[PDB]
Amino acid sequence: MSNLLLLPIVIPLVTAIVLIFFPKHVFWQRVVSLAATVGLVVASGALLHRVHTDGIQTLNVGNWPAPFGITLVSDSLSALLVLTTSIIALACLVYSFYAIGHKRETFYYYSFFQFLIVGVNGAFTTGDLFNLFVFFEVMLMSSYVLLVLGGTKIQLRETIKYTLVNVISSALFVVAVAYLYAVTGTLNMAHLADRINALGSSPILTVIAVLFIIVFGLKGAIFPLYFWLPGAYYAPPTPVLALFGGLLTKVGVYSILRTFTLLFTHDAAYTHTLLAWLALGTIIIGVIGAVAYNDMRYIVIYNIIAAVGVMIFGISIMTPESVEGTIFYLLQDMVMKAMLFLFVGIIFSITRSNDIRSFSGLITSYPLLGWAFFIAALSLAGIPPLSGFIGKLLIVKASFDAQLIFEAIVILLSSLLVLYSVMKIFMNGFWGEKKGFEQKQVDGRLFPVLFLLVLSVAYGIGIEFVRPFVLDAVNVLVDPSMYIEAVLK
């Protein structure tokens, strides 16, 4: 009944536990993890219909009242993010069936997979800051182990780097929770939102808001906190990397969004102009890195950084059109970056090389993959029949409506430069004469990528279907009175 909200959290968790007992039986690992992921997709869809039909769903974990225990809250935005996580997890799992070798999946691979999706699913639905902390470390610990698993030299080095950075950012989130507990005295989202709005004219709240910006920007890479991510994502294998690029950097964006639409509303000018300048710097760094490299993984990494910058610039305006645009761009960009990493993995499987200058002539031997990558690139750029159009369209419209001409022109030129990067991949890799590769029949792993591509195209066609969920999400984000009257009854 009312425990439906925990079904995105409880279903993978139990599954991870029962995958501990039989490591050497890889067939039953695959069968149990596949069946539980399909059930996760069904339960998340039922949760999304539940939060659409009647109101926002709140569940006290114990039978304890709203300030004094842990509350789990699913609004429409968290349900959309959970369903998107479920789809990305299913596609990455089937690619993991075809891609990960035998030795890496005898050693507890699918358990770590399920713990990572536990961490992200729990992070999208929570009502406490410290519970959100605990879910961040579940997510980060599973990401550490998935990064290091296999034990070659490269992933050892960049696991050291990635672990160091996330330890420092975890300690900074601890000290932020400490400062905010000293000021407010509570720990759940709704009641400390009420307490911040009772003393909203104090400067220490602005200082702690900037500290949360720094923490969540260390989580999801903002300029000038992005510096760990190129080597750290150049390290892991391909389905692990698709999980990382699809899920890890976007929960920091959700935390920034929830933080500045719920907690910190008074004295908005300073925090929003800081978010505007950090977002512009993030977009500039992303497009410079996308132009600079002739390496596929680095190109997709800097497209992640650029898209995070566009979403943060959409957050930095408190208008419902900008919030609607960044929600659309958020969902499609999660799906699209997971898709592009799976494409890069298939192309590396064919070419035995990652250098764009080394190989040419793939359309003459792999036509379906080539035109799938072509449609994926044009959907990444923002061409209007495809997925990523209505989001940046609403962002540009809301920036022109608030008299930000130069920033909208930066957004459009960034769209141009990210199109140039992925089409550089398409034109130098696929077109040309045949010199670089050897004829190798691909199998199986192409189909989750095609499934993600078909869902992205159907997303771009059916904006009118997917929109009223986003309308209820916007109606609860620009009005947190419904949030604080749903929890505090």
Binding site: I390, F400, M427, E464, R467
Partner: protein, 359 residues
């Protein structure tokens, strides 16, 4: 409404092309492409009686009704002139491409898929009344022409030309989108026929919308200094060169300028920018066209020169809106001149490319 199945019929036939291509190995696939532009051309002859006695044709297909977005279609004299041009020269280019290309040496299904996508996109550009739909069809035009320029992907210079044309036209299209959005905020609505009946000069977003729309329209039609991509798009097949760079894509910015002239020509920035850059690229391309040593570069600079002539006449026709001294009303002549030479240019320019392809 019978025109909903006219705008979206080249896309459906472009879906159905490779079926006929690899299931009918005897007959050349271009014949199966051949009746549809003919049919569209005959259908576009059916509206001339309704447009001479000042009646227009309106149609609506809603796409995102809550964000207030539709595929609208508004048919008047300018859109009929362009649509008749597109369909007539399209059928003639399809016939010339049947007799031009080969069967067992050329991938033909790709050729007619790309060409028919381009034809449907251009018919969508002309007939559209919604700004976002116009931008959608604009972008589809750019992508399909990008595919058509690089038809031989195993040669380097085709890929260089396709890359350069892609970057220039996408730059213009994105700034065109920005101008469309600023104009749609400046007015209350998104449809072009309701932006005419409302005042727009008392608004801060009027001048940036003017400059961005004007920038994109100059970028598409190979004006100064953005004429650079068109002499390197001459590595296409000769029917592609004829059709695209004679009658359809190089006149899209001309259509946008002439379509939004009843809105933006009340200011002087529009009319003098259009007139001066038209004269500059007219003289510059007319100077540069005599240096070349092959036929297609000469015809490319020729195309740039006559497009500059047409848009300078469009600028003087924008000057027509302010005042005419004591009922002289001479500036309107310029409009007619532009449209006449517009029609005129398309016809002979197509024939010239066909001629050089033969030889």
């Amino acid at each position: 409404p019978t025109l909903h199945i006219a705008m979206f019929a080249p896309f459906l036939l472009a879906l159905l092309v490779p079926f006929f291509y690899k299931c009918i190995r005897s007959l050349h696939v271009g014949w199966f492409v051949f009746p549809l532009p003919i049919a569209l051309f005959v259908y576009f002859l059916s509206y001339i009686d309704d447009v001479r006695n000042d009646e227009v044709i309106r149609a609506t297909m809603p796409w995102i009704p809550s964000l207030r977005i539709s595929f609208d279609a508004y048919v008047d004299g300018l859109s009929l002139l362009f649509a008749l041009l597109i369909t007539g020269i399209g059928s003639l280019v399809v016939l010339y491409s049947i007799y031009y290309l080969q069967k067992g040496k050329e991938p033909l299904g790709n050729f007619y898929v790309y060409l028919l996508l381009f034809m449907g996109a251009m018919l969508g550009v002309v007939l559209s009344d919604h700004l976002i739909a116009l931008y959608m069809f604009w972008e589809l035009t750019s992508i399909s022409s990008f595919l058509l320029i690089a038809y031989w992907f195993k040669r380097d210079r085709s890929r260089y030309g396709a890359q350069k044309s892609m970057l220039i036209t996408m730059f213009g299209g994105l700034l065109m989108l920005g101008g469309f959005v600023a104009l749609a905020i400046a007015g209350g609505t998104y449809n072009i026929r309701e932006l005419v009946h409302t005042p727009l000069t008392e608004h801060p977003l009027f001048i940036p919308a003017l400059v961005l729309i004007l920038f994109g329209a100059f970028t598409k039609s190979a004006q100064f200094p953005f004429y650079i991509w068109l002499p390197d798009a001459m590595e296409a097949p000769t029917p592609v060169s004829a059709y695209l760079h004679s009658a359809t894509m190089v006149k899209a910015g001309i259509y946008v300028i002439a379509r939004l002239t009843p809105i933006f020509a009340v200011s002087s920035v529009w009319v003098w920018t259009v007139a001066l850059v038209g004269l500059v690229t007219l003289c510059w391309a007319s100077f540069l066209a005599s240096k070349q040593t092959d036929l297609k570069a000469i015809l490319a600079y020729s195309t740039v020169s006559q497009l500059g002539l047409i848009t300078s006449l469009l600028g003087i026709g924008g000057l027509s809106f302010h005042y005419d001294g004591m009922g002289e009303n001479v500036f309107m002549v310029a409009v007619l001149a532009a449209i006449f030479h517009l029609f005129n240019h398309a016809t002979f320019k197509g024939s010239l490319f066909m001629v050089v392809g033969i030889v």
